[PDB]
Amino acid sequence: VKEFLAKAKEDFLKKWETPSQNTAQLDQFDRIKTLGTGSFGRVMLVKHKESGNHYAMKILDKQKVVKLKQIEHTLNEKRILQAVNFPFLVKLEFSFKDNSNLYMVMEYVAGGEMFSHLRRIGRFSEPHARFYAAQIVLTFEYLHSLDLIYRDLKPENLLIDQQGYIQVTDFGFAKRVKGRTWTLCGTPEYLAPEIILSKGYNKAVDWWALGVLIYEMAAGYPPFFADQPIQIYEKIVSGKVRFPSHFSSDLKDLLRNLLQVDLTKRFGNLKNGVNDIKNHKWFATTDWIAIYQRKVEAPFIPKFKGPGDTSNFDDYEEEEIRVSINEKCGKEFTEF
Amino acid sequence: TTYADFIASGRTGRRNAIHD
Ligand SMILES: Nc1ncnc2c1ncn2[C@@H]1O[C@H](COP(=O)(O)OP(=O)(O)OP(=O)(O)O)[C@@H](O)[C@H]1O
Ligand SMILES: [Mn+2]
Ligand SMILES: [Mn+2]
């Protein structure tokens, strides 16, 4: 492991240092359907005409980005995504901008969002959840190892591959930081106490969000939910958690350690690092390696009928794409 | 029940990220 990561650190760095720019043009793709949406941008199923391959195009309106103050985060996102390389992260194929927008062309993860399935089935069995969990674990250990923070773990941000494996998308909040950071970033239900507390934070936030994830997947709902955000933040800080009756003691306990309000008591943020987790009872049958190798028994497999089949995503109103005669915010995005 | 409680809440759909 330490071994692997070692080698891993070098790739990243090289890419980190010399990030790629404008590897394609709008024209070289055919707009198909809209796969999903977010607070910032949109994702369309696109098709590379010269190749015949499908991909996922993320469009960001330059002006909209500026208005929501996401100039620095966007740059991070593109910068971070092009350099990482892990079996559970989406692949960014191309990137380019135009007079009005920013584009990131990624591999298309057909399986759909874990969200849709989860909300579908209503809940995942302990073992099925442990499968995903296990994958997220390795992903953070990898990310954290590159001094990176993901800060936006949610089922809406997790895609299912053709093999039942996890593809992590949305690197919009990703940040390379040695030290504390203070931005209020996330998704309400996944926010860690210290974030909502405007107290300065680190990687431990990724760990908290993981407990929230495992909980939701196993329970079928979040540990803290209300109708408006402020009410959530409030429950989240109360420091009280309730577990469903069908949660093995093992589960209950791991979660106890992850949903630890006190960051010096937080699994992942302790002495034994990620080992505290990997070593946890609930994880006693998990073959970390087989998993990394994608050699494990995938509980569920989304089935898709034909390349470019979008049955695993919801339907979205098609906004049309628009490029202006004049450049909008050139300087601000000089490095994309 | 909790589940019942959740399903009638206003946050069952997809949740967007927070910003300003
Ligand atoms: N590579 C991909 N393959 C298939 N669908 C994807 C891909 N990337 C994103 N999607 C879909 O696009 C949706 C929104 O993209 P994304 O989450 O990056 O936008 P955003 O503006 O960053 O959203 P958020 O509000 O969570 O920050 C996802 O939730 C998912 O349904
Ligand atoms: Mn997202
Ligand atoms: Mn995002």
Short mmCIF file of all heavy atoms in Angstrom, two decimals, chain A residues 237-259:
data_model
loop_
_atom_site.label_atom_id
_atom_site.label_comp_id
_atom_site.label_asym_id
_atom_site.label_seq_id
_atom_site.Cartn_x
_atom_site.Cartn_y
_atom_site.Cartn_z
N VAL A 237 -25.33 19.31 14.55
CA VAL A 237 -24.44 19.71 15.64
C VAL A 237 -24.84 19.21 17.02
O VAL A 237 -24.00 19.14 17.93
CB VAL A 237 -24.08 21.19 15.62
CG1 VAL A 237 -23.40 21.55 14.31
CG2 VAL A 237 -25.36 22.01 15.73
N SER A 238 -26.12 18.85 17.17
CA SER A 238 -26.70 18.34 18.41
C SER A 238 -25.85 17.23 18.99
O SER A 238 -25.77 17.03 20.20
CB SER A 238 -28.09 17.82 18.15
OG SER A 238 -27.98 16.57 17.49
N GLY A 239 -25.24 16.50 18.07
CA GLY A 239 -24.38 15.40 18.37
C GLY A 239 -25.15 14.13 18.64
O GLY A 239 -24.64 13.21 19.26
N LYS A 240 -26.39 14.08 18.20
CA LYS A 240 -27.17 12.90 18.46
C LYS A 240 -27.54 12.14 17.23
O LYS A 240 -28.05 12.70 16.27
CB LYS A 240 -28.42 13.23 19.25
CG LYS A 240 -28.11 13.58 20.68
CD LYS A 240 -29.38 13.77 21.51
CE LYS A 240 -29.75 15.24 21.70
NZ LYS A 240 -30.90 15.68 20.88
N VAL A 241 -27.28 10.83 17.29
CA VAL A 241 -27.58 9.95 16.20
C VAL A 241 -28.41 8.76 16.63
O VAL A 241 -28.22 8.18 17.69
CB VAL A 241 -26.36 9.49 15.43
CG1 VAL A 241 -26.83 8.79 14.16
CG2 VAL A 241 -25.52 10.70 15.07
N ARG A 242 -29.33 8.38 15.76
CA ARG A 242 -30.18 7.27 16.06
C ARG A 242 -30.05 6.25 15.00
O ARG A 242 -30.11 6.56 13.82
CB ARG A 242 -31.62 7.69 16.12
CG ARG A 242 -31.75 9.15 16.56
CD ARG A 242 -31.79 9.23 18.07
NE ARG A 242 -31.68 7.90 18.65
CZ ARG A 242 -32.72 7.17 19.07
NH1 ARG A 242 -33.99 7.63 18.99
NH2 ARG A 242 -32.49 5.95 19.58
N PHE A 243 -29.86 5.03 15.43
CA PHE A 243 -29.75 3.95 14.52
C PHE A 243 -30.96 3.08 14.47
O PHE A 243 -31.58 2.68 15.48
CB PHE A 243 -28.64 3.02 14.92
CG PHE A 243 -27.36 3.74 15.02
CD1 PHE A 243 -26.79 4.03 16.26
CD2 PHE A 243 -26.71 4.13 13.86
CE1 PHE A 243 -25.57 4.69 16.34
CE2 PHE A 243 -25.48 4.77 13.92
CZ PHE A 243 -24.93 5.08 15.16
N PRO A 244 -31.25 2.76 13.25
CA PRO A 244 -32.30 1.87 12.92
C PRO A 244 -31.98 0.53 13.62
O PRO A 244 -30.81 0.19 13.85
CB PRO A 244 -32.23 1.74 11.39
CG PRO A 244 -31.28 2.80 10.89
CD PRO A 244 -30.55 3.36 12.10
N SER A 245 -33.05 -0.18 13.95
CA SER A 245 -33.00 -1.46 14.64
C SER A 245 -32.24 -2.57 13.91
O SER A 245 -31.67 -3.47 14.56
CB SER A 245 -34.43 -1.92 14.84
OG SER A 245 -35.27 -1.23 13.93
N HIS A 246 -32.23 -2.49 12.57
CA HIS A 246 -31.61 -3.48 11.68
C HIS A 246 -30.15 -3.30 11.34
O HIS A 246 -29.66 -3.88 10.35
CB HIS A 246 -32.40 -3.56 10.37
CG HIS A 246 -32.23 -2.35 9.51
ND1 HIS A 246 -31.03 -2.09 8.87
CD2 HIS A 246 -33.12 -1.36 9.21
CE1 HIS A 246 -31.21 -0.97 8.18
NE2 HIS A 246 -32.45 -0.52 8.37
N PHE A 247 -29.49 -2.50 12.16
CA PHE A 247 -28.09 -2.17 12.02
C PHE A 247 -27.29 -3.02 12.98
O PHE A 247 -27.34 -2.86 14.20
CB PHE A 247 -27.79 -0.69 12.39
CG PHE A 247 -27.90 0.35 11.29
CD1 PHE A 247 -28.71 0.15 10.17
CD2 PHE A 247 -27.21 1.56 11.41
CE1 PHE A 247 -28.82 1.13 9.17
CE2 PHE A 247 -27.30 2.55 10.43
CZ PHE A 247 -28.10 2.32 9.30
N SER A 248 -26.54 -3.94 12.43
CA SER A 248 -25.74 -4.76 13.26
C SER A 248 -24.91 -3.88 14.19
O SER A 248 -24.57 -2.73 13.87
CB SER A 248 -24.86 -5.63 12.40
OG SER A 248 -23.62 -4.98 12.19
N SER A 249 -24.61 -4.45 15.34
CA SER A 249 -23.82 -3.80 16.35
C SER A 249 -22.49 -3.35 15.79
O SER A 249 -21.96 -2.30 16.17
CB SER A 249 -23.59 -4.83 17.42
OG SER A 249 -24.40 -5.95 17.10
N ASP A 250 -21.98 -4.15 14.88
CA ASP A 250 -20.73 -3.83 14.26
C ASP A 250 -20.83 -2.52 13.50
O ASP A 250 -19.96 -1.67 13.59
CB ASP A 250 -20.19 -4.97 13.37
CG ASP A 250 -19.36 -5.99 14.12
OD1 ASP A 250 -19.07 -5.65 15.35
OD2 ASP A 250 -18.98 -7.03 13.61
N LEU A 251 -21.93 -2.39 12.75
CA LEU A 251 -22.22 -1.22 11.95
C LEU A 251 -22.39 0.01 12.80
O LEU A 251 -21.79 1.05 12.56
CB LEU A 251 -23.49 -1.45 11.13
CG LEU A 251 -23.83 -0.22 10.32
CD1 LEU A 251 -22.59 0.20 9.56
CD2 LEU A 251 -25.00 -0.51 9.38
N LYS A 252 -23.21 -0.17 13.81
CA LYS A 252 -23.54 0.85 14.77
C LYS A 252 -22.28 1.45 15.32
O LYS A 252 -22.15 2.66 15.46
CB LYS A 252 -24.28 0.27 15.97
CG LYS A 252 -25.75 -0.02 15.76
CD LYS A 252 -26.44 -0.45 17.06
CE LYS A 252 -27.94 -0.21 17.09
NZ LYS A 252 -28.74 -1.41 16.76
N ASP A 253 -21.36 0.57 15.67
CA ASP A 253 -20.13 1.02 16.25
C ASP A 253 -19.17 1.72 15.30
O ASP A 253 -18.62 2.75 15.62
CB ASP A 253 -19.47 0.03 17.19
CG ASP A 253 -18.20 -0.43 16.60
OD1 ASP A 253 -18.42 -1.27 15.62
OD2 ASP A 253 -17.11 -0.01 16.96
N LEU A 254 -18.97 1.19 14.12
CA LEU A 254 -18.10 1.88 13.18
C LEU A 254 -18.60 3.30 12.96
O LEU A 254 -17.83 4.27 12.92
CB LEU A 254 -18.23 1.18 11.81
CG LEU A 254 -17.08 1.44 10.81
CD1 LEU A 254 -17.62 1.37 9.40
CD2 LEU A 254 -16.36 2.76 11.06
N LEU A 255 -19.92 3.40 12.79
CA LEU A 255 -20.59 4.66 12.55
C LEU A 255 -20.41 5.62 13.71
O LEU A 255 -20.39 6.85 13.53
CB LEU A 255 -22.09 4.45 12.32
CG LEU A 255 -22.61 4.91 10.97
CD1 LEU A 255 -21.47 5.36 10.06
CD2 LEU A 255 -23.34 3.74 10.34
N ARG A 256 -20.32 5.02 14.89
CA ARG A 256 -20.16 5.79 16.10
C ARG A 256 -18.83 6.51 16.04
O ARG A 256 -18.64 7.66 16.46
CB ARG A 256 -20.23 4.87 17.31
CG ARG A 256 -21.60 4.83 18.02
CD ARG A 256 -21.57 3.91 19.27
NE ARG A 256 -22.34 2.66 19.14
CZ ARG A 256 -23.65 2.63 19.30
NH1 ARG A 256 -24.34 3.73 19.60
NH2 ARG A 256 -24.29 1.47 19.17
N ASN A 257 -17.90 5.81 15.46
CA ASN A 257 -16.57 6.34 15.35
C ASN A 257 -16.32 7.29 14.20
O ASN A 257 -15.36 8.04 14.23
CB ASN A 257 -15.57 5.18 15.35
CG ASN A 257 -15.68 4.43 16.67
OD1 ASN A 257 -15.72 3.18 16.70
ND2 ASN A 257 -15.78 5.20 17.77
N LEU A 258 -17.20 7.24 13.22
CA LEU A 258 -17.11 8.07 12.04
C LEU A 258 -17.90 9.34 12.24
O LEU A 258 -17.57 10.44 11.81
CB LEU A 258 -17.78 7.25 10.92
CG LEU A 258 -16.98 7.00 9.65
CD1 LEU A 258 -15.50 6.92 9.95
CD2 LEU A 258 -17.45 5.68 9.05
N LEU A 259 -19.01 9.17 12.94
CA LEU A 259 -19.89 10.27 13.20
C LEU A 259 -19.56 10.86 14.52
O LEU A 259 -20.36 11.16 15.40
CB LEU A 259 -21.36 9.86 12.98
CG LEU A 259 -21.65 9.32 11.56
CD1 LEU A 259 -23.14 9.17 11.35
CD2 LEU A 259 -21.12 10.25 10.47
#
